[PDB]
Scaffold this active site. Structure first.
Site, mmCIF file in Angstrom:
data_model
loop_
_atom_site.group_PDB
_atom_site.id
_atom_site.type_symbol
_atom_site.label_atom_id
_atom_site.label_comp_id
_atom_site.label_asym_id
_atom_site.label_seq_id
_atom_site.Cartn_x
_atom_site.Cartn_y
_atom_site.Cartn_z
ATOM 1 N N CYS A 1 0.852 -1.182 0.000
ATOM 2 C CA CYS A 1 0.000 0.000 0.000
ATOM 3 C C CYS A 1 0.891 1.236 0.000
ATOM 4 O O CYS A 1 1.625 1.466 -0.966
ATOM 5 C CB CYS A 1 -0.972 -0.002 1.191
ATOM 6 S SG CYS A 1 -0.290 -0.402 2.837
ATOM 7 N N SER A 2 0.845 2.038 1.062
ATOM 8 C CA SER A 2 1.727 3.196 1.162
ATOM 9 C C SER A 2 2.944 2.846 2.010
ATOM 10 O O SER A 2 4.063 2.753 1.493
ATOM 11 C CB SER A 2 0.988 4.405 1.745
ATOM 12 O OG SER A 2 0.253 4.063 2.910
ATOM 13 N N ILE B 1 2.028 -1.660 5.879
ATOM 14 C CA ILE B 1 1.793 -2.278 7.179
ATOM 15 C C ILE B 1 0.305 -2.276 7.515
ATOM 16 O O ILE B 1 -0.202 -3.226 8.122
ATOM 17 C CB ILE B 1 2.612 -1.576 8.280
ATOM 18 C CG1 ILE B 1 2.250 -0.092 8.370
ATOM 19 C CG2 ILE B 1 4.103 -1.732 8.019
ATOM 20 C CD1 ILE B 1 3.014 0.650 9.442
ATOM 21 N N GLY B 2 -0.410 -1.227 7.116
ATOM 22 C CA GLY B 2 -1.808 -1.087 7.477
ATOM 23 C C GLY B 2 -2.748 -1.881 6.593
ATOM 24 O O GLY B 2 -3.135 -3.003 6.939
ATOM 25 N N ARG B 3 -3.130 -1.300 5.450
ATOM 26 C CA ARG B 3 -3.952 -2.025 4.489
ATOM 27 C C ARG B 3 -3.277 -3.317 4.061
ATOM 28 O O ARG B 3 -3.933 -4.358 3.934
ATOM 29 C CB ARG B 3 -4.236 -1.152 3.268
ATOM 30 C CG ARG B 3 -4.925 0.161 3.578
ATOM 31 C CD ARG B 3 -5.173 0.954 2.304
ATOM 32 N NE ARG B 3 -5.609 2.316 2.589
ATOM 33 C CZ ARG B 3 -5.739 3.262 1.668
ATOM 34 N NH1 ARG B 3 -5.465 2.991 0.400
ATOM 35 N NH2 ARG B 3 -6.140 4.477 2.014
ATOM 36 N N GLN C 1 -3.038 -1.792 11.412
ATOM 37 C CA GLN C 1 -2.706 -0.536 12.080
ATOM 38 C C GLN C 1 -3.740 -0.103 13.113
ATOM 39 O O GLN C 1 -3.377 0.270 14.229
ATOM 40 C CB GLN C 1 -2.530 0.575 11.037
ATOM 41 C CG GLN C 1 -1.106 0.758 10.560
ATOM 42 C CD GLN C 1 -0.179 1.197 11.670
ATOM 43 O OE1 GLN C 1 -0.300 2.306 12.196
ATOM 44 N NE2 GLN C 1 0.757 0.326 12.035
#
Ligand SMILES: CC1(N)CCN(c2cnc3c(-c4cccc(Cl)c4Cl)n[nH]c3n2)CC1
Length: 494
Positions: A425-426, A429-431, A472
């Site tokens: 993603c960016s 870690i999150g999405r 996240q």
């Protein structure tokens, strides 16, 4: 250790706490209870209190005026060792010196609160092994606690459940004799290392907490029912309180010939799971639960060639992009694929955009990957670009992700001996973590039936040991439960 995080405390209570039981250099962390993803780093300094705001929209812990981090443990650790970066907006410097420890046992794995003595014995009789323990609120005396511990060998004969009274008198805790402790946690940790010995020999050993998160996937709907009274939030912060055990080394990402290869300066791959290129650095982690993953960041302009080196070296045939090129008015990932029907060279690599197929939730790009020089190294890499994911929060309905995820799984299985599935993603870690965790939990269900055992927090913590801060926010944690429940319904409805 992460005792400096106070889960259920107001902004003014943290002020009085730092000003009465703390000195300049004392600090704590706390969430805003009504605004999820809102966190404050309350630091005492110059006889006053400094509140530093932290925001987590789903990709990273954004400290206002500072940097972005994967976890709060890595944020607090970074500034305690890299003193000078946390500055008072107007040049002055903030010092994190003394963690002000919390006394709340709510975010502890072994504390079960308002639980009766018969339920506790039943769960330990059923699910407990040797050393499995729990601490509950006292049946008889209001304010006291009971440590229930199972001992034996794994029933028929010799395994037992010993109940130990924990008295709480004037804010101190004890087992009826010896040392009085300032918190239930300090008491448990003490007897976790120096276990109680019974009068006839048996050692009340505190090994692991009693597991209460593993459920049967068929009864997922029942557990989502109770987590939504709360249940979801108190189960997720108990997961966050165990992140302090995941401070593995990130020496390669911190080296300075690699600092430009990271989209976010302080979000780095673990050394023991990082992908090594044959320079050798890419912000990417091998994720292992025949399916593995590569969790990585959105490409920068200077790491597009390194990205395609990794995809080639790992024999990856599927790429999962869970972000737009630009979100929230900022670039989140470079366009690393050529236009449709076009052929482009990224270093020693060559990629042809064969055909693009647009769906409602995603764009599918059949890409042909080859190495320059070697005559026949071409392989079809399928790029699944999810586009309907919002900027903040999680999708309100998991249908689009589950169908997008079902298509990727079928693609990965169609290709014999395909490498890991690249997810990014960016920050990666999150999405990225939310996607991999959902796919890991579904891969278990689709194989060993709907009446199988799943453990959402244990799965996330296992993935978090391979890359920092996978999954996240609580909104993502809740979305993982909702996605698995929706998938459970569609099969048994069929
Ligand atoms: C009442 C409570 N305070 C809140 C709800 N319960 C739990 C129990 N186990 C957990 C986990 C977990 C599970 C396996 C491995 C690891 Cl590493 C973790 Cl961390 N994550 N979250 C929880 N929540 C019981 C205590």
């Amino acid at each position: 250790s992460r005792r400096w995080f106070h889960p259920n405390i107001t902004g003014v209570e943290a002020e009085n706490l730092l000003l009465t039981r703390g000195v300049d250099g004392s600090f704590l962390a706390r969430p805003s209870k009504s605004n999820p993803g809102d966190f404050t780093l309350s630091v005492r300094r110059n006889g006053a209190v400094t509140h530093i705001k932290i925001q987590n929209t789903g990709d990273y812990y954004d400290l206002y005026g500072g940097e972005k981090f994967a976890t709060l443990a890595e944020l607090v650790q970074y500034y305690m060792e890299h003193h000078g970066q946390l500055k008072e907006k107007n040049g002055d410097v903030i010092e994190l010196k003394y963690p002000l420890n919390c006394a709340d046992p709510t975010s502890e794995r072994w504390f079960h609160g308002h639980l009766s003595g018969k339920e506790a014995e039943k769960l330990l009789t059923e699910k407990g092994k040797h050393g499995s323990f729990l601490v509950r609120e006292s049946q008889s005396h209001p304010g006291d606690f009971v440590l229930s511990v199972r001992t034996g060998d794994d029933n028929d004969g010799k395994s037992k459940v010993t109940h130990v009274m924990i008295r709480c008198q004037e804010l101190k805790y004890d087992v009826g004799g010896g040392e009085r402790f300032d918190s239930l946690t300090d008491l448990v940790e003490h007897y976790k290392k120096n276990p109680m010995v019974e009068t006839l020999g048996t050692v009340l050993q505190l090994k692991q907490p009693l597991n209460t998160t593993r459920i049967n996937a068929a009864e997922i709907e029942s557990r989502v029912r109770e987590l939504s009274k709360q249940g979801f939030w108190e189960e997720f912060e108990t997961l966050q309180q165990q992140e302090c055990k995941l401070l593995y080394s990130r020496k390669e990402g911190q080296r300075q010939e690699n600092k430009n290869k990271n989209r976010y300066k302080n979000i780095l791959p673990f050394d023991h799971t990082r992908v090594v290129l044959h320079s050798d650095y890419i912000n990417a982690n091998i994720i292992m639960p025949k399916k593995s993953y590569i969790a990585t960041q959105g490409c920068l302009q200077n790491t597009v060639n390194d990205f395609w080196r990794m995809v080639f070296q790992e024999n990856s045939r599927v790429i999962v992009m869970t972000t737009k090129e630009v979100e929230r008015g900022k670039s989140k990932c470079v366009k690393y694929w050529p236009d449709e029907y076009a052929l482009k060279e990224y270093g020693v690599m060559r990629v042809r955009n064969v055909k693009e197929s647009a769906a409602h939730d995603y764009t599918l790009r059949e890409l042909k990957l080859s190495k320059v020089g070697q005559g026949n190294t071409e392989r079809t890499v399928w790029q699944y670009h999810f586009r309907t994911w919002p900027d903040h929060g999680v999708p309100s309905d998991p249908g689009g992700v589950l169908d997008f995820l079902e298509e990727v799984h079928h693609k990965q299985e169609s290709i014999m001996d395909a490498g890991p599935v690249v997810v990014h993603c960016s920050a990666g870690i999150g999405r990225t973590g939310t996607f991999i965790v959902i796919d890991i939990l579904i891969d278990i269900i689709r194989e060993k039936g709907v009446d199988c055992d799943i453990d959402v927090p244990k799965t996330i913590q296992m993935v978090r040991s391979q890359r920092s801060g996978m999954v996240q926010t609580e909104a993502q944690y809740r979305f993982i439960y909702m996605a698995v429940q929706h998938y459970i319904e569609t099969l048994q409805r069929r």
